[PDB]
Amino acid sequence: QLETAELEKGIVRVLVDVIGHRLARDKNNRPNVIRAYPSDNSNDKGLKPDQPFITVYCQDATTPYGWVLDKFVEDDAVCYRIAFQIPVLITVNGKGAHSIMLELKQRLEMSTTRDYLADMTGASVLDTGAIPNDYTYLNTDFENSAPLVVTLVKNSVLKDERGSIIERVIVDGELVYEEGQEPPEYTIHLDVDSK
Amino acid sequence: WNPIVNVDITLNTAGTTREGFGLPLFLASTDNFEERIRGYTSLTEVAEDFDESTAAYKAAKQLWSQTPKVTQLYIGRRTMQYTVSIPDTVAEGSEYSLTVAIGGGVSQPFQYTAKENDTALIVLNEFKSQIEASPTIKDGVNASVTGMIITKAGDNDFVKVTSITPTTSIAATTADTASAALASIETYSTDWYFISAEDRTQQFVLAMASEIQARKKIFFTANADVKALQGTDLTSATDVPAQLAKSKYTRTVCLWHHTAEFDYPEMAYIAYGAPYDAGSIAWGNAQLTGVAASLQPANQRPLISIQKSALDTRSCNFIDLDGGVPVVRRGITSGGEWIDIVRGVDWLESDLKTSLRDLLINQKGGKITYDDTGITRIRQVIETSLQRAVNRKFLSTYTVTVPKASQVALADKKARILKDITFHGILAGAILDVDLKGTVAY
Amino acid sequence: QQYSPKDVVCSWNGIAIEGFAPDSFLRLQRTSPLVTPVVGAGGQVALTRNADKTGTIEIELMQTSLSNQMLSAIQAKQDDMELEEDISSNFVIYDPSGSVLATGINAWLQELPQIELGRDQNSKTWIFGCEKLDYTSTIPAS
Amino acid sequence: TLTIDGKNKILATLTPTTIVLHNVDPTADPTANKVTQPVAIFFSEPNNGLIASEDTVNITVPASATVSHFSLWDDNSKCVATGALSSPQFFAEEGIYVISSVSIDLNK
Amino acid sequence: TLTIDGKNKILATLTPTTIVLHNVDPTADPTANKVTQPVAIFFSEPNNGLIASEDTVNITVPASATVSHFSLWDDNSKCVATGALSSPQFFAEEGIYVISSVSIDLNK
């Protein structure tokens, strides 16, 4: 199954291991990779972490690959498999954000990294966008940000608990000489079971 | 060691065979062969276990003469009830012998020769105690005392007693009213299609026809009684053809021939359409080689028109001598249905059953789900199965209607049941006889 | 009861072909016109009834769809079968709205798909023949 | 009918131990879409073909979660039984769902 | 209700071993009306909540006896299942009763 929340969680763990040697460390010496719009229970907001930090944000989830990729039957349930394409926005904030972002791009193509990302997420990278060197004016100085749009593709399998598959077929057939003949010339009754 | 080229010419004859829907089975009351449904592939093979006067060999020769040889012939045995009885008085110490054989491992002889004072019986009752004491015969052989009948009981099914001087006589086949014989033969193998029998009694013949009507097979009989070629009203006579027609049995073929007693002409009829395909043939006008025309037992002349018309009333087929060419006419079953239609229908069921079996058992494209896609899969197989009939020139058009998923009751889905699937095909007939009304010769 | 592409289902050789491309994914077409009128030099018109009803069914499945492997597996098996065995089966297309009402009687696999790997995910077009593309209708002869 | 002695002996091997609540019906798949964590449930001895819970069970359901169906488990992770609680309940804030009595019975 | 997996596990412990015929419905006092001898009966492994007899068993009914009901006594002399036959039959002489197949089922 596909859950955007789980996908963002999976990406964050990957970014910590992949690009962690260039970010800042908190009180637990954990590289500052956070999910966008942080918030705990109810309205408990989240503080802006230290500089060189990474923000992960799943922009949306489109399905340009058709309504249903395939429909198979599991043990006793009909399972639909839909193909999704999730654009995830990874943005690095802080001084020298562009240099940090560039390293991640050249590191998101390595086979070892993508194999790691394929695990614990279940998705595979489709492509990586362009990195704009953005300068925004907060209050006094300019904060460097380098957003990047990583596009992921994943297959979600959901089970319809109201399937009730076929196991027996009963066929009644008649043979006639012309279109009509209310008394059929010969009658066919079939009964095929899975036993 | 084998030579580089191994050549072995023999001054034998032709006999190239052909394969087609249906394999004949002959229910013969015999004593040889291992279990039921022995089988045979050539006339020589059927002669290595049967004699010329033996019923099975007589049937085998007729079926296997033709020209397109049938691939294989199945021969089954009816379970046997050998009865023993002393024909004379017991004289002092006259030696009596008998050997009972069951399964494969039983060849125990038995001698009593103990009648010093007087027996007037005894010996048979003495055998009863002895026959129930043999270590390898004790189980499987049920006996009695009369006033004996060595039948079978439990586990072992085949029994056989044979002597030289005293008796070991009779046959008295246990297999009763087909059902008993059929139940035994079904347990062994059910790959046969055409069924016949050596017995010709009214009780037995009427029993098979009712029994065959239940399952998907065709029964080929042959009657020769005179009482069938005289009656023109069905509900007047008690002849077997009349009995079959009255019961409306569509899976029983009757061939009225004068050799129906000592020979089995139905074998020739089977071997006319069995080698070929199913439904792409006409069992009507047929030039059966070897067998002669239907002769009158009283005059030894071919059947007259009224006699044939009386036969047509009972739907029993005959051999009409048209242009002085023995031709099996009618080609219809006792139920009024053409034989090819019955055979084609049986093939259609087999093909539909097999093709539909693949989705359910072999899970060809996966388990069938209960929606519009799953029902469509079933329609495709049914439509494909009927399409082979059209290519076979059996049907001409078909029309399959399936229920819509939304119109299916909740009960069927919970039971995982799909009903209300119907198809409607149109048969393709065959021209068997014409009527040319010439205008004039002005 | 309007046309919706989510209910159109196609089934061939007992399989449940699925995973259609978002764009045009099914394309039936008869290979010959019903009649070919012949116009005389004078102006008289005669009609020739074509006894050729064969058609062509094209299916556009996306490459990662599972039915792509199923169809290819059948094709590989069909090559190893002897010449006497059949390679055709009716092509039933069902749609509740009645947009399509054509059957694919005796449909065979004509052309293998053309793989077009690119930046994004492309489709694979399977082309099926047929001996008689029979157009049907809900309305009977009345 | 079946024997009560037989009904008692047959039911002595069930021994459900953990209970898990689901928002959807777990009949199709009792291994999926779980809500709570496995919480121990202890049953009595088979009597009159009906086992019953010994003590009450409190299941801590997380916030913004719905429970509608329940399921029981054993030591080797094998879902012996599934069912539906009285009515769906939505726990806005983190709350507790208490099981008052579970009575698996076979006496029809 | 129980699960298919749950039914299979539970059925694997009944293990009937012997069958005894009766003349009166053995509901209560199953030790009475013990017409025949404890002939052994073999059952297969549970499958979809159903066990079936491995082979046909023959019951050595004594002469001048009537049998209408049966019971499946297990290893430890417990009557786990009663039941009636098709119709009460009078074995006026010595004879044997053939049990083609007996199946215990919970799918109900």
Residue A191: which H helix or E strand, with range?
strand A186-193
Residue type, A171: V
- CA-to-CA distance for D87 and D97, rounded, in angstroms? 12
Taking contacts as CB-CB distances below 8 angstroms, the residues of chain E near D6 are 14, 78-81
Would you call E14 and D9 a contact, using CB atoms and an 8 Å cutoff? yes
In chain C, which residue's Cα lies nearest the Cα of B355?
C14
Per DSSP, what are the bridge partners of residue B171?
A: none
Which letter, b or e, does each residue of A159-191 get, where b requires 16 or more Cβ atoms within 10 Å of its Cβ?
A: bebebbbbbbbebebbbbeeeeeeeeebebebe
Would you call A161 and D63 a contact, using CB atoms and an 8 Å cutoff? no
Crossing angle for the helix pair B202-214 and B179-188, nearest 10 degrees?
Answer: 50
Give the helix, strand, coil percentages of chain A, each rounded to 5.
Answer: 15, 40, 40
- CA-to-CA distance for A11 and A4, rounded, in angstroms? 11
Specified resolution (Å): 3.4
Return the residue in C20, C89, C99 with the most chain B beta carbons within 10 A, the one to mutate for interface testing. C89
- CA-to-CA distance for A100 and A113, rounded, in angstroms? 16
DSSP summary character for residue D58: E
- CA-to-CA distance for C100 and C57, rounded, in angstroms? 12
- CA-to-CA distance for B231 and E101, rounded, in angstroms? 51
- Tell me the residue length of chain B: 442
Q: Compute the radius of gyration of chain D from its Cα atoms.
A: 15
Q: Compute the radius of gyration of chain A from its Cα atoms.
A: 27
Token readout for D52 is 């019953």
The gap between the terminal CA atoms of chain A, to the nearest Å, is 33
Chains that touch E (3 or more CB pairs under 8 A): D
In chain A, which residue's Cα lies nearest the Cα of C65?
A69
- CA-to-CA distance for B313 and B228, rounded, in angstroms? 10
Contact B136, B106 (CB under 8 A): yes
Chains A and B touch (3+ CB pairs under 8 A): yes
Contact B77, B29 (CB under 8 A): yes
Would you call C19 and A72 a contact, using CB atoms and an 8 Å cutoff? no
Helix (H, G, I), strand (E, B) or coil at A106: helix
Token readout for A188 is 């066919």
Taking contacts as CB-CB distances below 8 angstroms, the residues of chain D near A77 are 28-29
In chain A, which residue's Cα lies nearest the Cα of D24?
A161
Would you call B349 and A188 a contact, using CB atoms and an 8 Å cutoff? yes
Q: Breaks in chain D, named by the residue before each, with C–N above 2.5 Å?
A: none
Crossing angle for the helix pair B339-357 and B372-391, nearest 10 degrees?
Answer: 140
- Tell me the residue length of chain A: 195
Is C100 near chain B, with CB under 8 Å?
no
Taking contacts as CB-CB distances below 8 angstroms, the residues of chain A near D24 are 161
Is B364 near chain C, with CB under 8 Å?
yes
Which letter, b or e, does each residue of D29-57 get, where b requires 16 or more Cβ atoms within 10 Å of its Cβ?
A: bbeebebbeebebebeebeebbbebeeeb
Taking contacts as CB-CB distances below 8 angstroms, the residues of chain B near A75 are none
Contact E41, E83 (CB under 8 A): no
- Tell me the residue length of chain D: 108
Token readout for A52 is 């060189």
Contact E107, E8 (CB under 8 A): no
Residue D88: which H helix or E strand, with range?
strand D81-91
Q: How far is CA B62 from the centre of its chain?
A: 15
Token readout for E9 is 């596990």
Is A174 near chain C, with CB under 8 Å?
no
CA of B391: how far to CAs of B206, B377, B394, B398, C105, in Å?
37, 21, 8, 12, 11
- CA-to-CA distance for B321 and B269, rounded, in angstroms? 16
- CA-to-CA distance for D108 and E4, rounded, in angstroms? 17
Crossing angle for the helix pair A111-118 and A4-18, nearest 10 degrees?
Answer: 150
Helix (H, G, I), strand (E, B) or coil at A11: helix
In chain C, which residue's Cα lies nearest the Cα of A70?
C19
CA-based nearest distance A79→chain D, Å? 11
Would you call A159 and D28 a contact, using CB atoms and an 8 Å cutoff? yes
Q: Sign of torsion, CA C20 C24 C28 C31? A: negative
Q: What is the SS3 string spanning chain B?
A: CCCCCCCCCCCCCCCCEECCCCCEEEEECCCCCCCCCCCECCHHHHHCCCCCCCHHHHHHHHHCCCCCEECCEEEEECCCCEECCCCCCCCCCCCCEEEEEECCCCCEEEECCCCCCCCCCCHHHHHHHHHCCCCCCCCCEECCCCCCEEEECCCCCCEEEECCCCCCECCCCCCCCCHHHHHHHHHHCCCCCEEEECCCCHHHHHHHHHHHHHCCCEEEECCCCHHHCCCCCHHHCCCHHHHHHHHCCCCEEEECCCCCCCCCCHHHHHHHHCCCCCCCCCCCCECCCCCCCCECCCCCCECCHHHHHHHHHHCCECEEECCCCEEECCCECCCCCEHHHHHHHHHHHHHHHHHHHHHHHHCCCCCCCCCHHHHHHHHHHHHHHHHHHHHCCCEEECCEECCCHHHCCHHHHHHCCEEEEEEEEEECCCCCCCCCCCCCCC
Taking contacts as CB-CB distances below 8 angstroms, the residues of chain B near C92 are 376, 379-380, 383
Q: Sign of torsion, CA B87 B91 B97 B98? A: positive
Residues B407, B408, B410, CA angle at the centre, nearest 5°? 130
Is D91 near chain A, with CB under 8 Å?
no
User: What are E's interface residues with D at a Cβ cutoff of 8 A?
Assistant: 1-3, 5-6, 9-14, 27, 30, 74, 78-82
CA-based nearest distance E43→chain D, Å? 15
Residue type, B129: S
Chains that touch B (3 or more CB pairs under 8 A): A, C
Contact B269, B285 (CB under 8 A): no
- CA-to-CA distance for B303 and B439, rounded, in angstroms? 31
Return the residue in D24, D27, D29 with the most chain A beta carbons within 10 A, the one to mutate for interface testing. D29
CA-based nearest distance E77→chain D, Å? 11
Helix (H, G, I), strand (E, B) or coil at D72: strand
For residues B168, B172, B178 and B184, what is the CA-based torsion angle, rounded to 10 degrees?
A: -20
Helix (H, G, I), strand (E, B) or coil at A91: strand
Q: How far is CA A30 from the centre of its chain?
A: 25
Is C105 near chain B, with CB under 8 Å?
yes
Taking contacts as CB-CB distances below 8 angstroms, the residues of chain A near C20 are 66
Provide the pairing of β-strand B194-197 with B218-221. parallel
Is D25 near chain A, with CB under 8 Å?
yes
Would you call C121 and A69 a contact, using CB atoms and an 8 Å cutoff? no
CA-based nearest distance A78→chain B, Å? 7
Q: How far is CA B432 from the centre of its chain?
A: 27
Contact B72, B25 (CB under 8 A): no
Is B377 near chain C, with CB under 8 Å?
yes
CA-based nearest distance A83→chain B, Å? 20
- CA-to-CA distance for C22 and E1, rounded, in angstroms? 43
Crossing angle for the helix pair A97-107 and A4-18, nearest 10 degrees?
Answer: 100
In chain C, which residue's Cα lies nearest the Cα of B356?
C14
Return the residue in B380, B423, B431 with the most chain A beta carbons within 10 A, the one to mutate for interface testing. B423
Taking contacts as CB-CB distances below 8 angstroms, the residues of chain E near D30 are 3
- Provide CB contacts within 8 A for C128, sequence distance 6+: C12, C56, C57, C58, C59, C91, C104, C107, C108, C109, C110
- CA-to-CA distance for D13 and E5, rounded, in angstroms? 13
Q: Which of residues 123-182 of A touch B (CB under 8 A)?
A: 163-179
Is A75 near chain B, with CB under 8 Å?
no
CA-based nearest distance C102→chain B, Å? 13
CA of B210: how far to CAs of A1, B151, B203, D44, in Å?
59, 27, 11, 61
- CA-to-CA distance for B327 and B268, rounded, in angstroms? 12
- CA-to-CA distance for E86 and B321, rounded, in angstroms? 58
Chains that touch C (3 or more CB pairs under 8 A): A, B
Residue type, B183: A
